[PDB]
Amino acid sequence: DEQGCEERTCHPVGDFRCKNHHCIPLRWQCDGQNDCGDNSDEENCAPRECTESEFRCVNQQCIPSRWICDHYNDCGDNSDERDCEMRTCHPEYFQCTSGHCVHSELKCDGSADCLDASDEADCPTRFPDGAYCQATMFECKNHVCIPPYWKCDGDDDC
Amino acid sequence: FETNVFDRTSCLDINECEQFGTCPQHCRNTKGSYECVCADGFTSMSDRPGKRCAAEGSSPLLLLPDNVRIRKYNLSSERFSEYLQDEEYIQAVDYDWDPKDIGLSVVYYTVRGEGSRFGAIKRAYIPNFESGRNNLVQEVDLKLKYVMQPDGIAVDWVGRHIYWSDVKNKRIEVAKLDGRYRKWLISTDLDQPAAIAVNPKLGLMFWTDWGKEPKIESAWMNGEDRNILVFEDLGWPTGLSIDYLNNDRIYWSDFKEDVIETIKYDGTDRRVIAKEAMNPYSLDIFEDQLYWISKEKGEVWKQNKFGQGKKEKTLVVNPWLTQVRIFHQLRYNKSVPNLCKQICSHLCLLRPGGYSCACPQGSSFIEGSTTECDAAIELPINLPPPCRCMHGGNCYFDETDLPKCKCPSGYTGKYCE
Amino acid sequence: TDRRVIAKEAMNPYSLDIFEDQLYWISKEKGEVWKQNKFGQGKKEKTLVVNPWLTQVRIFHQLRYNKSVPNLCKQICSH
Ligand SMILES: *[C@@H]1O[C@H](CO)[C@@H](O[C@@H]2O[C@H](CO)[C@@H](O[C@@H]3O[C@H](CO)[C@@H](O)[C@H](O)[C@@H]3O)[C@H](O)[C@H]2NC(C)=O)[C@H](O)[C@H]1NC(C)=O
Ligand SMILES: *[C@@H]1O[C@H](CO)[C@@H](O[C@@H]2O[C@H](CO)[C@@H](O)[C@H](O)[C@H]2NC(C)=O)[C@H](O)[C@H]1NC(C)=O
């Protein structure tokens, strides 16, 4: 299969030829991935234009608009995680007090996805009985439902 | 050409001050003549016409922010005295001289982040008195978040405000000296901003954008009015300096085109002070001299501020060197008064011939009032007591973490005076 | 004969020198001086950061060079 690739040709349109005589789809060219091992696909790549729901990093890389202030610095230059206090947030996400966005589903779930743990401390007890931990878990001052086994378990997760 | 001694215009009172470089500091119009004079704290080296002016004080030093160190070099003593170390990615520096009237002075430098690690803007006490590592230096982060690349920085001593620029943010953000309230006074129409200077006397801030559109702006210190002084043949205009002593003239360096020029405060009279400076990166003017760094070889070059004479090499620091700032009392005239009358709730920015209230970013004035904003009032934050051991004394912290001095035999006192 | 690796990932070392039980090398990328146990034990320890212009590290000490070694030359050769 790999013997005659030098003689093998590529499709005239919608195909990119690499220095390894490798034919790859034109879409895969300049995708940020070495589809062909010689990196001919990514050798010369002007950054693409970001779409309507894509934020453009200072690295000229497009990331999903949901990832601005993602609290995980998805873009390499970390330009996504800036001005989070002035960014408001998307309608389907809850904004931490630090200003970062988090899924509204992950609010009051016992998991402090927000670094400041505001996603869990802003809600009452998970049950009116008077406690936040349903499964006999450990509730720290941040109301995080650290598992009962995980209670005082090595590093201070909360 | 003709015997028309009085052809409409004749020989009469000539404002020689209009001519460039007529006098180093202050020229006064005289009938068919001029009156060249220095200013307060400046004495004449020579005759009154074109009198050179000498600073009546301690020898000037050149703060040199290398990548990992910020060392001060005494021009007269021709020696390097270390001030800061163990830090990284230091880009721009500026100082406020004596904020609290003590011997030391606060120096505001910038740290640029790499990768995930964000940068920050930090301040610490530089002693005006000669002192190397004998006095421990405590850097204090202003805790400004989202600092990507603080390329330039300037200090508003009159307004007690720090003006800095970020290339990545493309925002010239201003904040209080401790960073209590931070505002985006321009944050628009900027592509790769660069070193910024502020003139409290004229109430004007000046910055450059070495980006695709090489421009030098002269917006108000509160940002209400914005205009472009020059936009032609600017290449990469990184580095800026204001000659407050002499007509508040503006000087800039073109890294890309390798030329250093100057313009008036309104940008009318454009002249070339010197050419072929081997890619200057920063400037600063003291007395009658201008210093610049050829970042390529990390060398300091001096020449007459009016373009006369020849460039002279003085020092060769590591290639890392990024800026040259002339550390002296008279460099930043502190006589200018403060027009702010503690009317604004959080921030009182300056403007030409006046003061205007502003609000921290993300907040607005309360309805019906232009003095009170909606944000809360943050408590003032001050630096810890600094090491003050004057003549080589080594400072040690007591059980109370209070800086005390191991005063040498040469002197005496609490601070080895 | 006996080839051993004292340390790995020294960040592009450029020069060496050994004194007592320690070996110093220069990471010429950012001009940092690193020290580690000469037998490969322990961990590398940063000591100094000078200009990238730094090109060598030389340990300046009396015992670094054994001046005791006698001279076998007996002023026989002309030059
Ligand atoms: C640097 O600071 C000194 C003060 O420490 C400045 O002295 C100033 O000198 C100007 C004149 O050149 C003063 O303006 C006028 O002075 C005359 C008397 O000569 C007076 O009759 C006028 O009413 C007016 O005050 C100015 O007031 C004074 N500065 C003060 C007191 O704030 C010096 O000029 C400065 N050098 C510069 C900026 O070049
Ligand atoms: C730079 O070095 C000079 C020379 O040491 C300092 O000036 C001297 O300061 C001492 C102490 O006040 C005086 O006794 C000398 O008469 C001064 N002489 C000269 C030639 O200036 C100068 O103060 C230093 N720079 C500073 C501290 O800003």
mmCIF file of C-alpha atoms in Angstrom, chain A residues 58 73 76-79 81-86 98 100, chain B residues 115-118 145-146 148 168-169 171 182 184 361-362:
data_model
loop_
_atom_site.group_PDB
_atom_site.id
_atom_site.type_symbol
_atom_site.label_atom_id
_atom_site.label_comp_id
_atom_site.label_asym_id
_atom_site.label_seq_id
_atom_site.Cartn_x
_atom_site.Cartn_y
_atom_site.Cartn_z
ATOM 1 C CA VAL A 58 -4.265 37.181 20.612
ATOM 2 C CA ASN A 73 -7.232 28.839 29.800
ATOM 3 C CA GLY A 76 -2.385 28.926 24.821
ATOM 4 C CA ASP A 77 -1.802 32.656 25.241
ATOM 5 C CA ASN A 78 -4.389 32.730 28.075
ATOM 6 C CA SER A 79 -6.045 35.719 26.389
ATOM 7 C CA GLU A 81 -9.327 34.371 30.582
ATOM 8 C CA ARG A 82 -9.377 38.147 30.861
ATOM 9 C CA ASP A 83 -11.852 40.862 31.860
ATOM 10 C CA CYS A 84 -14.111 38.215 33.371
ATOM 11 C CA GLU A 85 -15.709 40.740 35.726
ATOM 12 C CA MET A 86 -16.677 42.922 32.749
ATOM 13 C CA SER A 98 -14.440 35.814 40.462
ATOM 14 C CA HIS A 100 -15.594 33.292 35.384
ATOM 15 C CA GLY B 115 2.025 31.263 28.616
ATOM 16 C CA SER B 116 -0.557 30.519 31.283
ATOM 17 C CA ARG B 117 1.185 32.636 33.923
ATOM 18 C CA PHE B 118 -0.248 36.144 33.772
ATOM 19 C CA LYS B 145 -5.439 40.937 37.200
ATOM 20 C CA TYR B 146 -5.465 40.158 33.480
ATOM 21 C CA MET B 148 -0.737 40.231 29.669
ATOM 22 C CA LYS B 168 -2.143 42.162 24.116
ATOM 23 C CA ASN B 169 -4.989 43.987 25.852
ATOM 24 C CA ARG B 171 -5.823 49.065 26.420
ATOM 25 C CA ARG B 182 -8.628 50.616 37.539
ATOM 26 C CA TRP B 184 -9.866 51.785 30.725
ATOM 27 C CA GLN B 361 -14.195 50.011 35.152
ATOM 28 C CA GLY B 362 -17.456 48.127 35.505
#
